[model samples]
Target: TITVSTPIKQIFPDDAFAETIKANLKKKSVTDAVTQNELNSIDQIIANNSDIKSVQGIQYLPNVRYLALGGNKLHDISALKELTNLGWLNLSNNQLETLPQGVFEKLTNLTTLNLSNNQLTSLPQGVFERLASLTTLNLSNNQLTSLPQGVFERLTNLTTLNLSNNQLTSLPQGVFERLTNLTTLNLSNNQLTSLPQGVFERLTSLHTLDLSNNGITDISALKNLDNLHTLDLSNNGITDISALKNLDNLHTLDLSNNGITDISALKNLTSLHTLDLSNNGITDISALKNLDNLETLDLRNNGI
Candidate 1:
């Protein structure tokens, strides 16, 4: 008697996730079975808003370089650890409270990662230890209260980092020490009252810095960012912005709703095109008379 068995096809689990993969493959039904060769041909997966709770079988697509699984109810993403080729991943607007340790360790090629609009309270150390190629990371609209000191040390190539709309009270001194190439940094709408010294010392290439709606008073840490072009410090406690005198590249400056009385420092910011100094105690607009490049100037509710 001779017995032979036919090759088994890769069948996805009977769930919404299976339907998502089938739909991505252009299969008409959930009963469809995919072959490994077929999965290898796919390079991008757009499964956002598919109501996917689990991505248990996404590991089979080893060639996927871009994966968008946002706007879902996913809390466990351990299966994505296998997709080492992923260059851009969006897991925003989800139910993720926290990521498992080492879940993204193998995704060294990721250049952009968006984990915003989630319920993340805090991140575990070494979670992004190997993502040196990352350039943009958005962790805004979360409940993060603090960050570990060395969490972002390895992301040397990062250019844009958004940590706004959180509950952060204070930042570790050297958390951003390695992000020398950063250009845009947004830390607005937090509870921060002061900044740790030297936090922005290495970010010489910074162009835009947004610290609005925070309790920050001293911006001396930003003195060395001479390349800055746009600086937003609205709704803060800043009294002295002498730190901005040397930032001649400034084009847009917002210092509204502060306790500022002296703006003599902004006289040297001749490149300013839009200036918002509203709701301050400033008595003189004599200094701004020389800013021939001014396009929009807001000095409402001031002593002048």
Candidate 2:
């Protein structure tokens, strides 16, 4: 916390902040004996090794801007709460399941955070409320089953979010409505059956969405995502395609391995160059005539 106000008073600061806090903030190195003496103003710490298990000296580098402590057995991250100047952090492939309260509260300047391949099952409320400036987040390959309602309500600037490979059965309403700037979202390999209508109504800027390998049957929630360029609805229980009429800008659509029987709903999506209707009950190429822009249409295993 002294680093936050160290620039305020300007001088006579402790040797920890004076000797190493002014120049060359991006120097990079990896070693075991690298402690506070070598932490003068340098921002990056690459101490990732098989023998390295703890990152306990982080409190000494108050001005560190980036840290990669991945592939280690970290258990104490309490020292990171005060690293307000930190902009990038990678703690992936670790043994962390939960963080201390307000661990990320002061990390308002963080742009990217990688917590993938960890043991986290859930996060405390408002834990990400201060990461409003974050643009990319990776929480994939975890044990998360449910997330708090307001967990993502404050991340308005987030553009890419990876929640894939979890155990989420359902998502609360308005969980992602505030992320109007989102572009890429991955919710694949989950247990979601359905979603609320307005959950994705605000993501007009979204381009790619993957809800594959789920149990979703009612996709009325996706009726308004008209800006989608690529949509993966493969391997689900969807029987209705009427909601896709407004997605006129879609370039590729995957309806493969679903229960869709009607091709009438796809007549208006003329921008599609690739349409996969394979493994369905459709006996019609009648609706295919309306799509003159088609380059590849996979209708194998269909009634046609």
Candidate 3:
């Protein structure tokens, strides 16, 4: 019989790593037996590879539900097709150009897939069509210029999507209209000069939206995102934030590194918690005095 310890030192030979995992797990506080068993199995699989310091592609672990292959120079993940129970897969910081067609068809239980910081140029159409259980998808820091139309149509249950740090110039029409359950979306650090007029009209459940570090010169495109709580439009070419007046639910706003000369439009943002107006040409914060709920305000680097 195996007994769980509080410090997690009884199971691992190295006390330092055990303490690190213990500290990290403290934030999650997950007590589910199945989740713990799966995590332990993944640790055991990594530990079994004595000569291999880190696992790479062409590896097959039939029973593995969690796999971490980040920072490896893997080009193809076809060998992992046998991992039908895979729930979490991290292929970040790799040299992967594209996922094989039907790669995720058998991975019915996959919940999280991270393909960030890779050299992927394009994703195959219907690549994730069969992943009904996928909840989180991260495609940040890739070379994706445009996603295929209706790429996320099958992922009805997807909650979080990160498309930041890509080369996307524009999104397809009605691209996110089908993602009614999506909660968070990150579109920062891209080449988007303007968003479609009704790009976010269908995202009624979206809570957090990050559009910072783009070339957007207008805020009129975001007039329909009334449910957004945290909005980041920093490092863009916008001069007016008046269009954000309709977003009454916005709590955190980052407009740093922009051409803003007036913040009077932000006076009505009663729920604003954190506001970053640094690195701008703003000369007055007196307008923010009306914000009774302001928590953190950054006015650094501004002449005011």
Q: TM-score of each candidate?
A: 0.94, 0.85, 0.78
lDDT of 3 by residue, 204-258 (tens): 8899999999999888878878899999999999888888887879999999999
Residues 1-304 of candidate 2 have per-residue lDDT tens digits of 2333333113313323222233233323221223344455567765443333454445666778887768877766777887888898888888888877589999999999989888888888888999978998889888889889988999999999999888999899989979989999999888899788788889978999999888989989889899999998988898988989889999999999999998898998999999998998888678888897999889989887
Better of 2 and 3 by TM-score: 2
- What's the lDDT for residue 252 in model 3? 93
Residue 19 in candidate 3 has what lDDT? 36
Checking candidate 1 for backbone clashes, the offending pairs are none
**Per-residue lDDT tens digits of candidate 1, residues 1-304?**
0022211223445277777677677877666555677677779988788787888767777999999989988887888999999999999999889988899899999999999999999899988899999999999999999998799999999999999999999999999999989999999999998797799888977999999999999998888888999999999999998998999999999999999998889989999999999999998788897798999989999987
Task: Rank the candidate models, highest TM-score first.
Answer: 1, 2, 3
Candidate 2, clashing residue pairs? Answer: 20-40, 20-41
RMSD of each: 3.4, 6.1, 9.1
Best-performing candidate as measured by lDDT: 1
Model 2 ranges off by over 4 Å: 1-37, 47-51
- Model 3 clashing residue pairs (backbone): none
TM-score: the better of candidates 1 and 2: 1
